[PDB]
Amino acid sequence: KNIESLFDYSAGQFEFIDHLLTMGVGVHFAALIFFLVVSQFVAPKYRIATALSCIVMVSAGLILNSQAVMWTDAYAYVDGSYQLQDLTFSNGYRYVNWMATIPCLLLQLLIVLNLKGKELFSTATWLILAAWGMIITGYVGQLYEVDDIAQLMIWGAVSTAFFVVMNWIVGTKIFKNRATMLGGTDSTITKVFWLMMFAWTLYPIAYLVPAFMNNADGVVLRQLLFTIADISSKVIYGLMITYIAIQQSAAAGYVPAQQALGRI
Numbered sequence: 001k002n003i004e005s006l007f008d009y010s011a012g013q014f015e016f017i018d019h020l021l022t023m024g025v026g027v028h029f030a031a032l033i034f035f036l037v038v039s040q041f042v043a044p045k046y047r048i049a050t051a052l053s054c055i056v057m058v059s060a061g062l063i064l065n066s067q068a069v070m071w072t073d074a075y076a077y078v079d080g081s082y083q084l085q086d087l088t089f090s091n092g093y094r095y096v097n098w099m100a101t102i103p104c105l106l107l108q109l110l111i112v113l114n115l116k117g118k119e120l121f122s123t124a125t126w127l128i129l130a131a132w133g134m135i136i137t138g139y140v141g142q143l144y145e146v147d148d149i150a151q152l153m154i155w156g157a158v159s160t161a162f163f164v165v166m167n168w169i170v171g172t173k174i175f176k177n178r179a180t181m182l183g184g185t186d187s188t189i190t191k192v193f194w195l196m197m198f199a200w201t202l203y204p205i206a207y208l209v210p211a212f213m214n215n216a217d218g219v220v221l222r223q224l225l226f227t228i229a230d231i232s233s234k235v236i237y238g239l240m241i242t243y244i245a246i247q248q249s250a251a252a253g254y255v256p257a258q259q260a261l262g263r264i
């Protein structure tokens with residue numbers, strides 16, 4: 001049901017996609033160790049924001065690892081090209097993983113925005129419901145990326161509605177709570193918003209690839225877009241969230257944070 005299954009791949013195409021996924025694994029698990037070691041310099045009220053980056057690194061790293069092995073399982077070099085065998089490859093498992101990873105990305109944002117208690121629980125709940133609506137409708141949509149492009153487009157429009165509303169909740173909370181933030185991170189959090197708008201928008205572009213580039217090179221392009229998007233939305237994002245957490249920790253008087261920033 002996926003466009004990947006439609007084509008044979010050149011050695012170059014096949015190996016490049018393998019390398020993209022493998023590099024993806026390496027970057028996320030390398031970042032994992034960084035987040036782990038810097039977590040001790042985060043104040044208790046923000047430390048979970050850095051823990052969530054560890055959780056996202058392993059979750060994302062595992063899905064990329066799984067995709068890479070699925071890729072090599074599904075294709076074998078036969079008569080001069082990589083051809084589909086008995087096992088299958090699908091990006092559908094990425095969508096399932098987003099059900100977990102996107103709530104984690106959203107939660108760590110709410111934490112460094114200094115949301116607490118009732119507002120935190122209510123905002124997270126609405127955000128996660130919007131996100132799940134987006135992911136589920138998008139998942140249904142990509143079931144038709146070969147059979148019914150029109151249906152892909154309509155489910156995509158519904159998903160985009162959830163996306164836009166989710167982004168509005170995010171922006172509203174960011175620009176409202178920006179003033180509460182310490183150590184100059186009121187400025188930093190503004191860049192985080194724009195990073196999210198940029199990086200998360202790469203995913204619907206990848207979703208539309210079967211509509212505007214239904215060939216083997218389109219398959220490469222989509223994996224390339226996912227790679228840019230994953231690294232930006234999880235790793236670069238996580239680094240900014242952790243920076244914000246440490247900076248606010250230091251400004252709040254947490255001595256390990258002050259000491260850590262002092263060494264650099």
Ligand SMILES: *C/C=C(C)/C=C/C=C(C)/C=C/C1=C(C)CCCC1(C)C
Pocket residue numbers: 098101102105134135137138139141156159160163200201203204207230233234
């Ligand atoms: C780490 C993974 C992330 C941040 C994934 C984000 C995914 C999206 C923003 C997906 C958006 C979609 C649309 C807005 C329309 C087409 C269907 C989706 C689900 C690909």
Ligand SMILES: CCCCCCCC/C=C\CCCCCCCC(=O)O
Pocket residue numbers: 012013016220224227228231232
């Ligand atoms: C934050 C951005 C992270 C970027 C990650 C992607 C790094 C590698 C990017 C690709 C370089 C272009 C490779 C040339 C493609 C050759 C075409 C092919 O062989 O199929």
Ligand SMILES: [Cl-]
Pocket residue numbers: 043044045046
């Ligand atoms: Cl604290």
Ligand SMILES: [Cl-]
Pocket residue numbers: 059060063097098101
């Ligand atoms: Cl993920």
